[PDB]
Amino acid sequence: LYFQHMGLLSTNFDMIQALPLNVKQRVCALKNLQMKTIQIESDFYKRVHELEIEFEGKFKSTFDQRKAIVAGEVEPTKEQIDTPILEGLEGDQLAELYKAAEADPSAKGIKDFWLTALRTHDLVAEAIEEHDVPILSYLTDVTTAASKDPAGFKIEFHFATNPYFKNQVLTKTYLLGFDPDAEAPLQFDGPHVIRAVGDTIEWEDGKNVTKKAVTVKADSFFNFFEPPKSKDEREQAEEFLELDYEMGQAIRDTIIPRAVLFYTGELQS
Amino acid sequence: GLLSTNFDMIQALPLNVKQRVCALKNLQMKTIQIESDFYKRVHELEIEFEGKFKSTFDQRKAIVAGEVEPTKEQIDTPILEGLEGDQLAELYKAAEADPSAKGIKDFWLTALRTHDLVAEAIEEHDVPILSYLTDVTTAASKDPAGFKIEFHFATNPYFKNQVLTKTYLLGFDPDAEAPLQFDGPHVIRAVGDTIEWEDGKNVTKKAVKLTKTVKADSFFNFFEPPEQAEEFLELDYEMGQAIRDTIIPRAVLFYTGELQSDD
Amino acid sequence: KESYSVYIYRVLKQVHPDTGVSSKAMSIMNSFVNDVFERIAAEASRLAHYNKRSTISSREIQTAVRLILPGELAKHAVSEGTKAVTKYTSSKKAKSRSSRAGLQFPVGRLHRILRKGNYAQRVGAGAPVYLAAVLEYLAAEVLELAGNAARDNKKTRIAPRHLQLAVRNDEELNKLLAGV
């Protein structure tokens, strides 16, 4: 669904045009009432944002335990071991899988967990180039948190010590508007991205896959940490900005809460 | 489960790594339980906001019915947001006032049929029936968990009901037999409403020749909800969701057609 | 009584990027599209009312188009509909049917209107693709000629009179749109 900003392109324009004037004025009243409905909805979305912040403390422990498992810092419990690796399979079918590959003591944690999860999501996979793959192998965790003031959220990408860059955490921050646009209020469909803020990557010599010599910008997942700038910092750039935000939403709303389901590929499109 | 995108990788994992994935499956179940509490709180949030939305919807119904007259501050709102000063003044001059026209005729019919999903359900013999629709409302409940949509019809020659009610019962907990599915609230049951049709007006039923009575196509099968049974219910629910979440809060934008989709 | 105004406008920007169209001219364009659609659909039904299941395919639309549109318009429309179907069956974020076919006119909505009017009810996916390309081709031809007439008259906005000059002075468009 899109808002038609060219009123003469409105689907029912000719019906509107033919309305007698006294009926038109009733429609005008409804447009005024619609703006008030949208103001109340903006308050609703602010309350939802508060709920998400409140639940961060509850989600945190499950995500922290997941990071510890992925890194090999903690051993699965007996009740964890007895959980089926894939949801559909029964005792007989499972014992097959568990015998298909003997234990390897040289294998610590779950290698390539976040790389696999991210690349199984069709939107994020488009953003992963081949020279990005060995870098994302060092990703030990992906986390997210929201704020009320300033309104928005961040995503943090935690990297083990690696030969590509020195940073241990790459942060992507989105500042969101929760109020309707005063000059176009009727389009309001929820929070909208004001600005995206990336992070400076301290690349080791000759490892910067975001650059190529023709020196130009190369295609790379890590351009996520140079987001497009808003208009107050400069066109087509705002569609770039929306596509960056949509990937941030995918990572925060979908991949982070259900990472292992993307790792196994049990979440499909 | 064997359909998983990355099954071959999973199979090849060494056993000690497999057990770590198993641990992650158990942790994922706990995440989903917390998510289920989140959606319950959101449902309560929606209930809380019904009282806040109610007045705008009431004033809209009164305007649509012609029970109250627009104020000056209301009249000065552009009928269409997109237009420039010049074109707007033309539009207001294109058709003179008609004192015999009360309220906004066919408001909900036009709004419902301009939404591409609901338009799929509206047949031509439904159109004159939906002309009598005076209001569409929605409310949510915790006991039993779900929501309803109510369609208010003025006195009409098609059926005797003055309110047609559609009720959805929602499960907010993960399915104990498939906890990893959980995607949010899911429909347990849909409950419709018996339409008391006047003679020869029931467009939802036709006979075919033994002589059997079969379902005919009509929007009003929305009020007779159900191996295929799970395919109807999901599309019935999605139409219900569209009306509750999209059409009711933004009705006038579908009336004007300022909200469009490109299917 | 359907509106294709947003699609007509997007097609206008393709043939005349800096040209507008008045609201009354847009109503006339819609009448053109609706009249051609109804005629094409009514004959596609009649031609498929005689096979077993009654299933309107890409090939029934093609025959109805050869019957309704005159001479060179028919050949070009058939060309366009054929290319749209081929690109659509060759095609694969989820992309809409219209963009899969490389079209601006709405494939999904035309499928719904076809299925609705019960024109030989049961409609194949290729049929709205083909018909959308035909109506889009006709819209583009009219708009191209009307746009030319507009800025020949020193205007940047297609008015009703620029549409009548475009239609009446073109032999095949005039025969196709005479009754409207």
The answer, yes or no, to whether the previous bond of A228 is cis (omega within 30 of 0) is: no
- Alpha-carbon distance of B90 to B196, in angstroms, equals 46
Residue A52 is labelled as binding a ligand = yes
Say which residue the tokens 């390309």 belong to.
C133
Q: Which amino acid is at A203?
A: W
Closest residue in B to C103 (Cα) is B262
Nearest to A208 by CA among A163, A160, A156, A161: A163
Cα dist. A74→A106, A115, A169 in Å?
15, 21, 22
Secondary structure letter of residue B101 according to DSSP? -
Inter-residue contact B180 to B29 (CB < 8 Å): yes
C104 part of contact set with chain B, CB < 8 Å: no
Closest residue in B to A18 (Cα) is B95
Can you give B194-240 as a three-state secondary structure string?
CCCECCCCCCCEEEECCCEEEECCCHHHHHCCCCCHHHHHHHHHHHH
Resolution in A: 2.2
- Alpha-carbon distance of A45 to A67, in angstroms, equals 30
C24 part of contact set with chain B, CB < 8 Å: no
**CA–centroid distance for C75 within its chain:** 14
Kindly compute the dihedral angle of the four CA atoms of residues B31, B32, B38, B43, in this order, to the nearest 10 degrees.
180
Beta strands in A151-261 (DSSP E): 151-159, 169-177, 192-197, 211-212, 216-217
Nearest CB to C98; choose among B124, B260, B262 = B262
Contacts of A14 in chain C (CB under 8 A): 3, 27, 30
**CA–centroid distance for B18 within its chain:** 44
Distance to chain B for C70, nearest Cα, Å: 31
Can you give C102-171 as a three-state secondary structure string?
CCCCCHHHHHHHHHHCCCCCCECCHHHHHHHHHHHHHHHHHHHHHHHHHHHCCCCEECHHHHHHHHHCCH
Kindly compute the dihedral angle of the four CA atoms of residues A137, A141, A142, A147, in this order, to the nearest 10 degrees.
-150
Sequence-distant (≥ 6) Cβ neighbours of residue A100 within 8 angstroms: B11, B12
C90 part of contact set with chain A, CB < 8 Å: no
Q: Which amino acid is at C1?
A: K
- Alpha-carbon distance of B36 to B172, in angstroms, equals 6
Query: Please, which residues bridge with residue C157 across strands?
Result: C20
Nearest CB to A123; choose among C6, C30, C93 = C93
Closest residue in C to A6 (Cα) is C6
Q: Do C112 and B116 touch (CB under 8 A)?
A: yes
- Alpha-carbon distance of B132 to B105, in angstroms, equals 9
What is the bridge-based pairing of β-strands B186-191 and C20-21?
unpaired
Nearest CB to B116; choose among C3, C97, C109 = C109
∠ CA(A122), CA(B28), CA(A114), 5° rounding? 45
Closest residue in C to A12 (Cα) is C3
Nearest CB to A76; choose among B23, B77, B91 = B23
Q: Do C23 and A17 touch (CB under 8 A)?
A: yes
Determine the 3-state secondary structure of A226 from DSSP. coil
Can you give A115-157 as a three-state secondary structure string?
HHHHHHCHHHHHHCCHHHHHHHCCEEEEEEEEEECCEEEEEEE
Helices (H) and strands (E) in chain A, counts: 9, 7
Inter-residue contact C140 to C13 (CB < 8 Å): no
Chain A and chain C share a number of CB contacts under 8 A equal to 24
Can you give B122-154 as a three-state secondary structure string?
CCHHHHHHHCCEEEEEEEEEECCEEEEEEEEEC
CATH of residue C21's domain is 1.10.20.10
Residue A131 is labelled as binding a ligand = no
Sequence-distant (≥ 6) Cβ neighbours of residue C21 within 8 angstroms: C8, C9, C12, C29, C143, C157, C158
- Alpha-carbon distance of A233 to A223, in angstroms, equals 18
- Provide the domain limits for residue C92: 1-180
| The total number of structural domains that make up chain A | 1
- Provide the domain limits for residue A153: 1-269
Q: Do B83 and A51 touch (CB under 8 A)?
A: no
Inter-residue contact A59 to B37 (CB < 8 Å): no
In which element (H, E) is residue B188 found?
strand B186-191
Can you give C51-92 as a three-state secondary structure string?
CCCCCECHHHHHHHHHHHCCHHHHHHHHHHHHHHHHHHHCCC
| The total number of structural domains that make up chain C | 1
Q: Do B123 and C116 touch (CB under 8 A)?
A: yes
Closest residue in A to B28 (Cα) is A258
Contacts of A34 in chain B (CB under 8 A): 56, 250, 252-253
Nearest to A212 by CA among A129, A115, A127: A129
Secondary structure letter of residue A233 according to DSSP? G
Q: Do B1 and A33 touch (CB under 8 A)?
A: no
Query: Please, which residues bridge with residue A155 across strands?
Result: A144, A172
Distance to chain A for C70, nearest Cα, Å: 30
C147 part of contact set with chain B, CB < 8 Å: no
Q: Among C95, C116, C121, C136, which would you mutate to test the B interface (most chain B Cβ atoms within 10 Å of its Cβ)?
A: C116
Task: Please give the backbone phi and psi of residue A121, each rounded to the nearest 5 degrees, phi first.
Answer: -80, 125
